[PDB]
């Protein structure tokens, strides 16, 4: 079942959803959330319609009349004449499938290298070798937002993710990075989330309480064509291996908060519904945006006293970025110049060192790498954690949240 | 209400309404008196059980 | 042989059928283990010895010996399996002519098929072929009696139409009654009929194998009279069977397109996963005389430090001795534990390790994101569609451990349920028409966070934990897992964590007992040794109790109660069980007293906590080699110095003075 | 065996009084001392055999009426086929498609002439129960197994849902004329032959109680007997005994009743064994329920009445107060 893309919706309309049929090689070539491009032929399929209004009967052309006691009247006569309703549905028969926007022109780094063409591969290699690639990626990914360089860097690291691992006893070591943005109104939090979505594939949006638990995680519906059950994917599922952007997170309901907490913690979703059980891996990275209680971030309080998120949900976040509106004339001038230049020169004023598609390809190529921790790196890590914990000692000014 | 009787409070240590307290035929106040002999006897009895 | 037409008809034809029967009989009778050992002789010997009805043939061996049969098997598996069953029955009867009265049928289970197909790759090409796949059993129906050789009663003249082979494709519908020739209604004669056990399972692609953003595909499999109960929901299995297509499912009801619901007739299931020499060796381990320390160090090998928590968990795992004077004074034998701690203290890891080790260990959470729940209800199950009395996670561990995470974030009903379970060890349902009281005698290991997310010793444990006093009282051990910025501890913990990460990267003072040995030790200790309290110093313990009470009301603190002495008795019994003594020895009593004290002291505020620690240091210092005490004193002195320095910007005398409060050469070396 | 029981009953009650001449059927419920077998042990091998199973009841349908003997009449000739035996258990019956009447050369009766005569039928009680694998008997990670039970004529309303029972019955299948994926599977059940519930004063016991009351220090005997294992609190134990025995409940001529029950409150420090005293009193009272202030796990402190939207019945969920009626 596919539905019309947002780029084609008429005003005030609900997207049209139709079922397309894949046969033979293409049978499993389309997966949920993909922006596919089905090529084939439209067709009609006879329908057992529930319309109570009779319409378009089809019957025999042979003129036959029932004899006394067997008159062609009623169900008997309808059956004898072979009357059947001609009710149809429109169904699409797709011979080939392909993504609307190809990323390149099992999975492994060598597989990605082979899949991508020579020019794309050389572009990925040259940008990987390029210096200050960190700043280049941040700027090219957020060319309209001013400041918040820490937030840009954190979101970029979230996009690149970590290296998931499994311990010998079975316990898994989560490698996905969770980022949350708390701050004053009109601080570009939603702008960061929308940038992330419009850039990253497998990136989904949700708002405070515009989503239900079933629509956020998964639902189960029987397959009308057989005895099986289809799982309709939720936002976390469609973002699996990608990003779920939860704006107005603080307003999300308690049940949805529990569901998202479970997804962030165990990276799996369990459904025991509609006659079927199923566990589905949800390797989503969560980018959340929340508003402090009272709307403005009181700098004289901890994040626990500022935001309404529960303690487990707060803990499961790797990064917490605070964007407090500084009433500084210089910053206001910079923001105004950025915004006004954007609105003046729309096509121009956006010079990105790396194209968005090139960044997508490079990110896909890099996600396969699973860097290991060297011994000097481990020593440095323990030293840095030592410094971080020492920063939490008494005497020094209290921090927003502990270490 | 305070977790311990706290004889000093007198009656603030019970929050039951007079209507409710009238219902009960009998009311007992069980204060864990700490006579040393009773304490030793209680420990010995518990261990004996 | 190999000629003619498609394999199905080629092997259906008699000539080739008898030829292949003879070939398989020869293969069965003549086959070595690569060392001359006639494998099939011993296989059939043990099969008939244990009355198993199933002979497992290795496909690799079959291919090596007779390649024609191996090539034909994955093309027409039904006929080949029937032929193999007949030949195996003939050979088994020849070996044991008396075995005909046990089974009269032998199932040949193929094994180690070369190609392994994943559920997402099953197509119409693989229809009516033997395939090997791997998956996770999601649901599994009960064992159902399916008709195998069905006799029919003709309810017109009461004749008994003889047995008809109930195939797995279509219902067997008799024709006329041979006597009265009436095609009229027939009934199944259930007394004369013989049934084969039938089970239906669902296996889905394992989440690890599921890749990218693809959904896990599931398939239905059918188990027949020997594969039944060979798997349970959640088990990871490898299934070999016929990709069936044609039983009754074609969607002919015009509901839509003419698709066929395919099922897999399971032919061989291989799961992917009692104390005689065990009991021989665990007694020696008990006599080792350091078994208590060995166990305490073997608990939670992946968790650094927290020796007190590990010791308490060991005592809880081994449990106490329940008793009931007469039938009127029930006293639990379960040691309940409550780890209250600020974030980042491995409480969840402790609970998960206890889940992994303990048998009958069920993990529930104070949130609503758990497979089970604390409160029992009655409803139609989502999957089984069956009206079931879903008892709570307190009842699913009647004789085990309930691991209640986030114990501070429980609903009103959850709190009431846990109160009922802890105080009564029973759960009462009065729900639809079910008025029942079912026993839940679990040991509760709970994890909780303090009010505000940071334990404050200034206040007491009761007002730090965010729990009701009745709820707290029913816990024998209260582990205050405080977090402090201690240089050495932070460095060591960072080393541990980074090392675990390094060694688990995907591209790859006594020795702890191995985990399986610890499990078996626990089984034996809980099952056989039952410590008795005949030899315990009533005078000493009563004096300790009286002194503790006196010191309790000498300051403004929570008084000690008979509850604490009973918990100490339970812990003494637990230590005696750890050492298999069968009698609590004075050292066991002292260790139980040390645990009970440490807990009760930590439950107090700093003002009274330190006072009680100083007053009762005699008990707290038991089984301390006098090096840990000195190390802790040095650590507190250096912590005072470092907190002084960090704000403004140790001598031997202070250490010797605190030691006096005499030998420091051993500590230095 | 049931036929022989009928014969023996007739033999032993032959000279019955007028108005009760007709001999009545006899139900032989069979009970065994043998150890029961697990529900998981019920395999195809035991089908149609007398099996014994433990379980806990979770449902008990209403006592409907099922026909042991039916009578049918021909629509045309109005001749009867009285006393057609009905197979016991969940087994149906196909009506004849021909009229027996010895035709006198008239046009023959129609193809399907027989109609049931509900007036001329012998019907018996029949109840359908749901039995569940005992929670302890369930393997650690495993959903409980369920069985359906058929009860007839005295096995109906002998056990209410929630009871723990051992059932001796004929592991059977539904027989309704062999009419997705499961081919050859017929829903199974147990035609219960015997019910035992897992849990009346003799003259000897009455004499014992009478003499015990006649004892001089019966008060002291009872007071000590209540909680011997609880130290001290002699007055509290005396009060507990007074509560257990209760006063007299009286209905005055005007219709105003006076309660005989005694209500006792124990406000005390957490150390004392007041909860243990409550537990003993709950175990010791004839009818006794122990509950917290906020009720138990999935049980209420007081009754709650609701209306079923479908059947429009008044379902009264019984709390502790109503469940422990006439007791403590
Ligand atoms: N003592 C320790 N030794 C080794 N690893 C530890 C230790 N304490 C914590 N960790 C690790 O640090 C992280 C924090 O542990 P964990 O997630 O169990 O916290 P927690 O105590 O459950 O927290 P919370 O109560 O906030 O949920 C995990 O990776 C855990 O493996
Ligand atoms: N620091 C900034 N730099 C550039 N634009 C900004 C900045 N802060 C706010 N804006 C502008 O303000 C608008 C509203 O911000 P919004 O996304 O609503 O933030 P929030 O969701 O946190 O209120 C955005 O469209 C954005 O262009
Ligand atoms: N006077 C006593 N006699 C016998 N046992 C006692 C006494 N006081 C306390 N106990 C013991 O203390 C334990 C805890 O008592 P508990 O039932 O929790 O009372 P409370 O509900 O008031 O806390 C009980 O197991 C009980 O055996
Ligand atoms: Mg916003
Ligand atoms: Mg935790
Ligand atoms: Mg109590
Ligand atoms: Zn016949
Ligand atoms: Zn007739």
UniProtKB/Swiss-Prot annotation, chain A:
Top-rank lineage group of the source organism: Eukaryota
Q: Name one GO biological process term.
A: double-strand break repair via break-induced replication
Q: Where is the MCM domain?
A: 133-340
- Give the sites modified to Phosphothreonine: 72
PTM characteristics = O-glycosylated (O-GlcNAcylated), in a cell cycle-dependent manner.
Task: Give the primary localization class.
Answer: nucleus
Q: Where is this motif: Arginine finger?
A: 315-318
Where in the cell is the protein located? Nucleus; Chromosome
Alphabetically ordered keywords of this record: Acetylation, ATP-binding, Cell cycle, Chromosome, DNA replication, DNA-binding, Glycoprotein, Helicase, Hydrolase, Nucleotide-binding, Nucleus, Phosphoprotein
- Tell me where in this chain the PTM Phosphoserine is found: 13, 65
Presence of keyword Transmembrane helix? no
The protein's GO terms of the molecular function aspect are:
ATP binding; ATP hydrolysis activity; DNA helicase activity; identical protein binding; single-stranded DNA binding
Which sites bind ATP?
Answer: 146, 186-190, 291
Cellular component annotations (GO), alphabetically ordered? chromosome, telomeric region; CMG complex; cytosol; MCM complex; nucleoplasm; nucleus
Q: Does the keyword Cell cycle apply?
A: yes
| Family, per entry | Belongs to the MCM family.
Kindly give any further remark recorded in the entry.
Early fractionation of eukaryotic MCM proteins yielded a variety of dimeric, trimeric and tetrameric complexes with unclear biological significance. Specifically a MCM467 subcomplex is shown to have in vitro helicase activity which is inhibited by the MCM2 subunit. The MCM2-7 hexamer is the proposed physiological active complex.
This one is known as: DNA replication licensing factor MCM6
Q: Which organism is it from?
A: Homo sapiens
What stretch of the parent protein is included here? 207 to 616 of 821
UniProtKB/Swiss-Prot annotation, chain B:
Give the UniProt subcellular location, in the record's own words: Nucleus; Chromosome
Annotated disulfide bonds? none
Q: Which residues are listed as membrane-spanning? A: none
UniProt disease link: Meier-Gorlin syndrome 8: A form of Meier-Gorlin syndrome, a syndrome characterized by bilateral microtia, aplasia/hypoplasia of the patellae, and severe intrauterine and postnatal growth retardation with short stature and poor weight gain. Additional clinical findings include anomalies of cranial sutures, microcephaly, apparently low-set and simple ears, microstomia, full lips, highly arched or cleft palate, micrognathia, genitourinary tract anomalies, and various skeletal anomalies.
**What role does this protein play?**
Acts as a component of the MCM2-7 complex (MCM complex) which is the replicative helicase essential for 'once per cell cycle' DNA replication initiation and elongation in eukaryotic cells. Core component of CDC45-MCM-GINS (CMG) helicase, the molecular machine that unwinds template DNA during replication, and around which the replisome is built.
Q: Which family does it belong to?
A: Belongs to the MCM family.
**Further details from the record:** Early fractionation of eukaryotic MCM proteins yielded a variety of dimeric, trimeric and tetrameric complexes with unclear biological significance. The MCM2-7 hexamer is the proposed physiological active complex.
Q: What is this protein called?
A: DNA replication licensing factor MCM5
Q: Which organism is it from?
A: Homo sapiens
Tell me the lineage of the source organism. Eukaryota, Metazoa, Chordata, Craniata, Vertebrata
Q: Gene encoding it?
A: MCM5
Which residues of the complete protein does this chain represent?
A: 491 to 539 of 734
From Swiss-Prot, chain C:
Name the major location: nucleus
Could you cite one Gene Ontology molecular function of this protein?
ATP binding
Q: Which residues carry this modification: Phosphoserine?
A: 206, 302
Q: Where is this cross-link: Glycyl lysine isopeptide (Lys-Gly) (interchain with G-Cter in SUMO2)?
A: 3
List zinc finger spans: C4-type. Answer: 154-180
Task: Identify residues that carry N6-acetyllysine.
Answer: 41
Q: Which catalytic reaction applies to this protein?
A: ATP + H2O = ADP + phosphate + H(+)
The MCM domain covers which part of the protein?
291-497
GO cellular component labels: chromatin; chromosome, telomeric region; cilium; CMG complex; cytoplasm; cytosol; intracellular membrane-bounded organelle; MCM complex
Any GO BP annotation: double-strand break repair via break-induced replication
Per the UniProt entry, the Enzyme Commission number(s) are 3.6.4.12
Q: Consult the record and explain the modifications the protein receives after translation.
A: Phosphorylation by the CDC7-DBF4 complex during G1/S phase is required for the initiation of DNA replication.
Per UniProt, the short sequence motif Arginine finger occupies residue numbers: 473-476
Q: Is Transcription tagged as a keyword?
A: no
Per UniProt, the keywords (alphabetical) are: Acetylation, ATP-binding, Cell cycle, Chromosome, Deafness, Disease variant, DNA replication, DNA-binding, Helicase, Hydrolase, Isopeptide bond, Metal-binding, Non-syndromic deafness, Nucleotide-binding, Nucleus, Phosphoprotein, Ubl conjugation, Zinc, Zinc-finger
Which domain of life does the UniProt lineage start with? Eukaryota
Described purpose of this protein according to its UniProt entry: Acts as a component of the MCM2-7 complex (MCM complex) which is the replicative helicase essential for 'once per cell cycle' DNA replication initiation and elongation in eukaryotic cells. Core component of CDC45-MCM-GINS (CMG) helicase, the molecular machine that unwinds template DNA during replication, and around which the replisome is built.
Instruction: Name the family the entry cites.
Output: Belongs to the MCM family.
Protein name from the UniProt record: DNA replication licensing factor MCM2
Q: Which organism is it from?
A: Homo sapiens
What fragment of the whole protein does this chain represent? 176 to 882 of 904
From Swiss-Prot, chain D:
Q: Which residues carry this modification: Phosphoserine?
A: 202
Q: Where does ADP bind?
A: 258
Which UniProt keywords are given for this protein, alphabetically ordered? Answer: Acetylation, ATP-binding, Cell cycle, Chromosome, Disease variant, DNA replication, DNA-binding, Dwarfism, Helicase, Hydrolase, Nucleotide-binding, Nucleus, Phosphoprotein
Look up the record and give one Gene Ontology term from the biological process aspect: regulation of DNA-templated DNA replication initiation
Q: What domain of life is recorded for the organism?
A: Eukaryota
Tell me the residues on which N6-acetyllysine occurs. Answer: 279, 283
Further comment found in the protein's record = Early fractionation of eukaryotic MCM proteins yielded a variety of dimeric, trimeric and tetrameric complexes with unclear biological significance. The MCM2-7 hexamer is the proposed physiological active complex.
Spell out the subunit comment: Component of the MCM2-7 complex. The complex forms a toroidal hexameric ring with the proposed subunit order MCM2-MCM6-MCM4-MCM7-MCM3-MCM5. Component of the CMG helicase complex, a hexameric ring of related MCM2-7 subunits stabilized by CDC45 and the tetrameric GINS complex. Interacts with ANKRD17. Interacts with MCMBP. Interacts with TONSL; the interaction is direct.
Record-stated family: Belongs to the MCM family.
| Record-given protein name | DNA replication licensing factor MCM5
* Organism listed in the record: Homo sapiens
In the record, what lineage is assigned to the organism producing the protein? Answer: Eukaryota, Metazoa, Chordata, Craniata, Vertebrata
Covered range within the whole protein? 99 to 441 of 734
């Amino acid at each position: 079942r596919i539905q019309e893309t947002q780029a084609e919706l008429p005003r005030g309309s609900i997207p049209r959803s139709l079922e397309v049929i894949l046969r033979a090689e293409a049978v499993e070539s389309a997966q949920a959330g993909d922006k596919c491009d089905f090529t084939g032929t439209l067709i009609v399929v006879p329908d057992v319609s529930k319309l109570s209004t009779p319409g378009a009967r089809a019957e025999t052309n042979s003129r036959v009349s029932g004899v006394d006691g067997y008159e062609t009247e009623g169900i008997r006569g309808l059956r004898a004449l072979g009357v059947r309703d001609l009710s149809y549905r429109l169904v699409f028969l797709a011979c080939c499938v392909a993504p609307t926007n190809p990323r390149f022109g099992e999975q492994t780094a060598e597989s990605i290298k082979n899949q991508m063409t020579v020019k794309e591969w050389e572009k990925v290699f040259e940008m990987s070798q390029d210096k200050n690639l960190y700043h280049n990626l941040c700027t090219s990914l957020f060319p309209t937002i001013h400041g918040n360089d820490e937030v840009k860097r954190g979101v970029l690291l979230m996009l690149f993710g970590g290296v998931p691992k499994t311990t010998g006893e079975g316990t898994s070591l989560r490698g996905d990075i969770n980022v949350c943005i708390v701050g004053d109104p009109s601080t570009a939090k939603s702008q960061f989330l929308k940038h992330v979505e419009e850039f990253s594939p497998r990136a989904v949006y949700t708002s405070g309480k515009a989503s239900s638990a079933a629509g956020l995680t998964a639902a189960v519906v029987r397959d009308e064509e057989s005895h099986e059950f289809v799982i309709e994917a939720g936002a976390l599922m469609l973002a699996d291996n990608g990003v779920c952007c939860i704006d107005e997170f603080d307003k999300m309901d308690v049940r949805d908060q529990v569901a998202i907490h479970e997804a962030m913690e165990q990276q799996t979703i369990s459904i025991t519904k509609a006659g079927v059980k199923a566990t589905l891996n949800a390797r989503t990275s969560i980018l959340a945006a929340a508003n402090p209680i009272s709307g403005h971030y009181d700098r004289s309080k901890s994040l626990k006293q500022n935001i309404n998120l529960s303690a487990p949900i707060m803990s499961r976040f790797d990064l917490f970025f605070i964007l407090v509106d500084e009433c500084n004339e210089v910053t206001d001038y910079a923001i105004a110049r950025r915004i006004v230049d954007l609105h003046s020169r729309i096509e121009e004023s956006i010079d990105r060192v790396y194209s968005l598609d090139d960044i997508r390809r490079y990110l896909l190529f890099a996600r396969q790498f699973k860097p290991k921790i060297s011994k000097e790196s481990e020593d440095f890590i323990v030293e840095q954690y030592k410094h971080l914990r020492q920063r939490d000692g008494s005497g020094v000014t209290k921090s927003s949240w502990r270490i | 209400v305070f977790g311990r009787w706290d004889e000093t409070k007198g009656e603030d240590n019970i929050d039951f309404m007079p209507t409710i307290l009238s219902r009960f035929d009998m009311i007992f106040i069980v204060k864990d008196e700490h006579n040393e002999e009773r304490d030793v006897m209680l420990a010995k009895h518990v261990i004996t059980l | 042989d190999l000629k003619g037409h498609s394999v199905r008809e080629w092997v259906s034809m008699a000539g080739p059928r008898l030829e292949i029967h003879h070939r398989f009989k020869n293969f069965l009778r003549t086959h070595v283990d690569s060392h001359g050992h006639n494998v099939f002789k011993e296989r059939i010997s043990d099969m008939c010895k244990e009355n198993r009805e199933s002979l497992v043939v290795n496909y690799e061996d079959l291919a090596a010996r007779e390649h024609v049969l191996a090539y034909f098997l994955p093309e027409a598996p039904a006929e080949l399996l029937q032929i193999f069953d007949e030949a195996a029955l003939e050979v088994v009867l020849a070996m044991y002519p008396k075995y005909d009265r046990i089974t009269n049928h032998i199932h040949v289970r193929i094994s180690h098929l070369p190609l392994v197909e994943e559920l997402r790759s099953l197509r119409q090409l693989h229809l009516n072929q033997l395939i090997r796949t791997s998956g996770v059993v999601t649901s599994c129906t009960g064992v159902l009696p399916q008709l195998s050789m069905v006799k029919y009663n003709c309810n017109k003249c009461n004749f008994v139409l003889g047995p008809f082979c109930q195939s797995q494709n279509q219902e067997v519908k008799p024709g006329s009654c041979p006597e009265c020739q009436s095609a009229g209604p027939f009934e199944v004669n259930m007394e004369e009929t013989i049934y084969q056990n039938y089970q239906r399972i669902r296996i889905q692609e394992s989440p690890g194998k599921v890749a990218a953003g693809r959904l896990p595909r599931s398939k239905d499999a059918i188990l027949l009279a020997d594969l039944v109960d060979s798997c349970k929901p959640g088990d990871e299995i490898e299934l070999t069977g016929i990709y069936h297509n044609n039983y009754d499912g074609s969607l002919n009801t015009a509901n839509g397109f003419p698709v066929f619901a395919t099922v897999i007739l399971a032919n061989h299931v291989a799961k992917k996963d009692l104390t005689d020499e065990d009991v021989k060796m665990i007694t020696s381990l008990s006599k080792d005389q350091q078994i208590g320390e060995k166990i305490f160090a073997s608990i939670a090998p992946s968790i650094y430090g927290h020796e007190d928590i590990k010791r308490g968990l060991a005592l809880a795992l081994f449990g106490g001795e329940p008793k009931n004077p007469g039938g009127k004074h029930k006293v639990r034998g379960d040691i309940n534990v409550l780890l209250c701690g600020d974030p980042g203290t491995a409480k969840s890891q402790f609970l998960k390790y206890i889940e992994k080790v303990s048998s009958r260990a069920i993990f529930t959470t104070g949130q609503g994101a758990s497979a089970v729940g604390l409160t029992a209800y009655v409803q139609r199950h989502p999957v089984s569609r069956e009206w079931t009395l879903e008892a709570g996670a307190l009842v699913l561990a009647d004789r085990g451990v309930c691991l209640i995470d986030e114990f501070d974030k429980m609903n009103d009903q959850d709190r009431t349920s846990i109160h009922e379970a802890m105080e009564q060890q029973s759960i009462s349902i009065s729900k639809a028409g079910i008025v029942t009281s079912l026993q839940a005698r679990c040991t509760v290991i709970a994890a909780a966070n303090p009010i505000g997310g940071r334990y404050d010793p200034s206040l007491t444990f009761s007002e730090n934990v965010d729990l009701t006093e009745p709820i707290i009282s029913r816990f024998d051990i209260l582990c205050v897992v405080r977090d402090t910025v201690d240089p050495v501890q932070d460095e060591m913990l960072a080393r541990f964590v980074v090392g675990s990460h390094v060694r688990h990267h995907p591209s790859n003072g006594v020795e702890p007992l191995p985990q399986e040995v610890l499990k078996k030790y626990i089984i034996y200790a809980k099952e056989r040794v039952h410590p008795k309290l005949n030899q315990m110093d009533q005078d000493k313990v009563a004096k300790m109790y009286s002194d503790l009470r006196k010191e309790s009301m000498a300051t403004g603190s929570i008084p000690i109660t008979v509850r604490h002495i009973e918990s100490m008795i339970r812990m003494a019994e637990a230590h005696a069980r750890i050492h298999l003594r069968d009698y609590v020895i004075e050292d066991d009593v002292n260790m139980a007293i040390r645990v009970m004290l440490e807990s009760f002291i930590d439950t107090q505020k700093f003002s009274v906590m330190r006072s009680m620690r100083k007053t009762f240091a005699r008990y707290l210092s038991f089984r301390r080699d006098n090096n840990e005490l000195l190390l802790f004193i040095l650590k507190q002195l250096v912590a005072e110095q470092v907190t002084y320095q960090r704000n403004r910007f140790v001598p031997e005398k202070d250490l010797v003075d605190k030691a006096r409060q005499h030998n420091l050469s051993a500590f230095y070396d | 065996l049931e036929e022989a029981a009928k014969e023996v009953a007739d033999e032993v009650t032959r000279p019955r009084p007028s108005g009760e001449e007709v001999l009545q059927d006899i139900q032989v419920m069979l009970k065994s001392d043998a150890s029961p077998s697990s529900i998981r042990s019920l395999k195809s091998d035991m089908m149609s055999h007398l099996v014994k199973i433990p379980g806990i009841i979770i449902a008990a349908s209403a006592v409907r009426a099922k026909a042991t003997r039916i009578s049918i009449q021909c629509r045309s000739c109005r001749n009867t086929l009285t006393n057609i035996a009905m197979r016991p258990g969940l087994e149906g019956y196909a009506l004849p498609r021909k009229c027996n009447t010895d035709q006198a050369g008239r046009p023959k009766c129609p193809l399907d002439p027989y109609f049931i005569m509900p007036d001329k039928c012998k019907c018996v009680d029949f109840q359908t129960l749901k039995l569940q694998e005992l929670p302890d008997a369930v393997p650690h990670g495993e959903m409980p197994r369920h069985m359906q039970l058929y009860c007839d004529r005295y096995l109906c309303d002998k056990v209410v849902p929630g009871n723990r029972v051992t059932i001796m019955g004929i592991y059977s299948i539904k027989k309704f004329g062999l009419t997705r994926v499961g081919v050859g599977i017929r829903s199974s059940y147990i035609r219960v032959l015997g019910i035992q519930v897992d849990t009346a004063v003799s003259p000897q016991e009455e004499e014992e109680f009478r003499r015990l009351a006649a004892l001089p220090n019966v008060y002291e005997v009872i007071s000590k007997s209540i909680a011997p294992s609880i130290f001290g609190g002699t007055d509290m134990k005396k009060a507990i005994a007074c509560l257990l025995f209760g006063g007299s409940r009286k209905r005055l001529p005007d219709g105003l009743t006076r309660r005989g029950d005694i209500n006792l409150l124990m406000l005390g420090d957490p150390g004392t064994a007041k909860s243990q005293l409550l537990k003993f009193v709950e175990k010791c009272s004839p009818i006794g329920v122990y509950t917290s202030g906020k009720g138990s796990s999935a049980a209420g402190l007081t009754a709650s009445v609701m209306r079923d939207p479908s059947s429009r019945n008044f379902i009264m969920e019984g709390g502790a107060m109503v469940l422990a009626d006439g007791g403590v």
